[PDB]
């Protein structure tokens, strides 16, 4: 609801609560009521925070080291991590993006999410509900959220505190990852760091150069 967002923001920060200069809590840009917009915005914020904090940890890990499994060193020797991503095989990037899309279409589907006992976030579900992976006859050893258990005995208040902590952590980590990408692309952007370097090509581009693909890889005429 509209009143719940100010309470959640005050729980996240008591000094500054309900900070929306752009408002955005009344723009019904889906035409499905005010609650649907609030649920979409909360889910987008939480997803962006999770992805951004995981990307920050991954950039910190892969900016210095690699994984010794199967010739994963020539790709790690491609300067910046974004150039390493652009230097990965086409099948690798395709399967990674399709894997993430499979997780997204599993989470958003409001019949598997109904098997977990909740609903879609635009229809009253909680913001961020990647559910248990028990829907098909293919026995999975571990699920997505809490893979090696260790969270069954958690309390409701502890869950709410952890949710607020994760929201604030992603709130910081989105700006952190954006600053890392900006310093990678345009030097002198991040004034508190001068160590990260090398170009990223186009940072918002999954396919580049060696990616052949069925046409439409017109990397010519780029922008800033």
């Amino acid at each position: 609801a509209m009143s719940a967002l100010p309470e959640l923001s005050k729980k996240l920060n008591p000094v500054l609560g309900y900070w929306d200069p752009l408002n955005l809590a009344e723009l019904n840009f889906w035409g499905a009521g005010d609650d649907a917009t609030v649920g979409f915005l909360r889910h987008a914020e939480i997803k962006h925070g999770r992805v951004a904090m995981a990307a920050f940890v991954g950039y910190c890990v892969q900016s210095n080291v690699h994984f010794p499994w199967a010739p994963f060193n020539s790709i790690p020797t491609n300067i910046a991590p974004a150039e390493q991503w652009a230097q990965l095989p086409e099948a690798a990037k395709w399967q990674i993006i399709l894997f993430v899309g499979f997780l997204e279409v599993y989470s958003e589907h409001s019949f598997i999410l109904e098997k977990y006992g909740q609903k879609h976030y635009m229809k009253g579900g909680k913001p961020g509900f990647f559910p248990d992976f028990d829907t098909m006859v293919h026995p999975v050893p571990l699920n997505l959220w809490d893979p090696l258990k260790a969270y069954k005995g958690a309390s409701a208040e502890r869950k709410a505190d952890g949710l607020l902590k994760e929201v604030n952590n992603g709130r910081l980590a989105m700006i952190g990852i954006m600053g890392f990408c900006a310093e990678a692309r345009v030097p002198g952007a991040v004034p508190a760091l001068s160590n990260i370097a090398h170009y990223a090509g186009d940072p918002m581009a999954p396919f580049a150069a060696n990616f052949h693909l069925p046409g439409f890889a017109s990397x010519x005429x780029x922008x800033x």
């Binding site: 200069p21 752009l22 408002n23 955005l24 723009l27 019904n28 840009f29």
Partner: peptide, 13 residues
Amino acid sequence: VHPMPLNLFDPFK
């Protein structure tokens, strides 16, 4: 026909 994020007179509240 498509919702505008915020109006022209007072863009913020």
